[PDB]
């Protein structure tokens, strides 16, 4: 029965994995039935025109589409039609709360809303980037993939991560019911390689309390 | 060196963080 007990998965797998490698994959996170329900909720968001072009933290002159080709919407988890996405978010949060004080030196107190994202085939992807390069509070990226029948050799869409200090990169296929964690800072630059079929994923970013407070102070003072 | 914030995925700064 999935999801697995959070305490053991967090302390005996996620924590040591994250501290050693900065990247952790949990396959078959919620099971087929729940994963399919999430897929249907995501496809209904897509079908009803909720997605908008993905955006960047800062922009000068470049079109966002020369950088990221996905379309997204932000989900709080309590919206009608998003109940199973809410269960996913609650399950991610459960894991993080069982990791309190054990993920590096971070104190994780909060997170973003969920970013439901679609790369609509057609070779769309995301150029090599860092999720939080300049201290905006994000310390852990958590992604759930929902692509049933994804054949990455044909459809592409691999997330390639270049973890600092390793002799090989980490290729993450966007597999159905796969959960991924990685450090959001400069230790993990990464690319979404071009996707040739419709590719869905849901991301939440967890905040380190002290860094996020400093970032909010900068925003609220116009700096 | 490139300003990496121009490649980084947007998040709301203003009133939209969730407390755990
Ligand atoms: O969807 C993925 O596998 C990776 N997503 C990103 O890198 C992003 O949206 O910042
Ligand atoms: Cl929860
Ligand atoms: Mg611009
Ligand atoms: Mg925690
Ligand atoms: Mg709350
Ligand atoms: Mn990213």
- Tell me the C-alpha distance between A119 and A81, whole Å: 21
Number of domains in chain A: 1
Give the technique used to solve this structure: X-ray
- Least Cα distance to A26 among A150, A168, A144 occurs for A144
Residues 6+ apart with CB under 8 A from A168: none
Tokens of A134: 């300049």
- Tell me the C-alpha distance between A90 and A85, whole Å: 9
Query: Which residue segment(s) compose the domain that A167 sits in?
Result: 1-223
Resolution for this experimental structure (Å): 1.2
Output the CA A212–ligand 5 centroid distance in Å: 16
CA distances from B1 to A56, A95, A154, A204, B6 (A): 18, 37, 35, 28, 12
- Tell me the C-alpha distance between A58 and A56, whole Å: 5
- Tell me the C-alpha distance between A138 and A189, whole Å: 14
Q: Is A119 in the pocket of ligand 1 (CB under 6 A)?
A: no
- Category of A142 on φ-ψ map: left (φ > 0), alpha (ψ -120 to 50) or beta: beta
Q: Which H or E element spans position A223?
A: none
- Least Cα distance to A111 among A130, A91, A81, A82 occurs for A91
- Least Cα distance to A199 among A142, A152, A167 occurs for A152
Tokens 């060196």 belong to which residue? B1
Tokens 């967090």 belong to which residue? A10
Nearest by CB to residue A133, choosing from B8, B16, B19, is B8
């Amino acid at each position: 029965t999935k999801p697995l007990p959070a305490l053991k998965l967090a302390l005996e797998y996620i924590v040591p994995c994250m501290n050693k490698h900065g990247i952790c994959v949990v396959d078959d996170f919620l099971g087929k039935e729940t994963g399919q329900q999430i897929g249907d909720e995501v496809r209904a968001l897509h079908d009803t025109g909720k997605f908008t072009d993905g955006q960047l933290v800062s922009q000068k002159s470049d079109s966002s589409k020369d950088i990221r080709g996905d379309k997204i919407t932000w989900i709080e988890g309590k919206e009608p039609g998003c109940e199973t996405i809410g269960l996913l978010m609650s399950s991610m949060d459960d894991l993080i709360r069982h990791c309190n004080g054990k993920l590096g030196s971070y104190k994780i107190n909060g997170r973003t809303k969920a970013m439901v994202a679609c790369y609509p085939g057609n070779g769309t992807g995301y150029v090599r980037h860092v999720d939080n390069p300049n201290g905006d509070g994000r310390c852990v990226t958590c992604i759930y993939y929902l692509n049933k029948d994804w054949d990455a050799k044909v459809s592409g869409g691999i997330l390639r991560i270049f973890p600092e200090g390793k002799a090989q990169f980490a290729d993450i296929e966007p597999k159905f019911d796969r959960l991924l964690f990685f450090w959001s800072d400069r230790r993990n630059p990464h690319e979404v390689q071009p996707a040739y079929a419709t590719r869905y994923a849901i991301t939440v970013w967890y905040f380190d309390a002290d860094e996020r407070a400093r970032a909010k102070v900068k925003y609220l003072t116009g700096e | 060196e490139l300003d990496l914030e121009t490649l980084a995925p947007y998040i709301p700064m203003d009133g939209e963080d969730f407390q755990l």
